[PDB]
């Protein structure tokens, strides 16, 4: 999230913590839209898939730490 979307670690970690805690899609969308272009780009990358499901799958694929870095 950091290297490929320019989302800072503190925001990225917050978002992934919400994902892992089973938080609401609305919360994730609000944080990502508020961080600006990087968050908008990440939402775009998810396509039509729920941003929650998309990040869940990225965490499964790469591990949480690597998703933050990404």
UniProtKB/TrEMBL annotation:
Keywords of this entry: Antibiotic, Antimicrobial, Bacteriocin, Membrane, Plasmid, Secreted, Transmembrane, Transmembrane helix
Any one Gene Ontology BP term: killing of cells of another organism
Statement: the UniProt record of this protein carries the keyword Secreted: yes
One cellular-component annotation, GO: extracellular region
Transmembrane segment boundaries: 25-47
Compartments where located: Secreted
Name assigned to this protein: AS-48 protein
Organism of this sequence: Enterococcus faecalis
Lineage: Bacteria, Bacillati, Bacillota, Bacilli, Lactobacillales
Range within the parent protein: 36 to 105 of 105
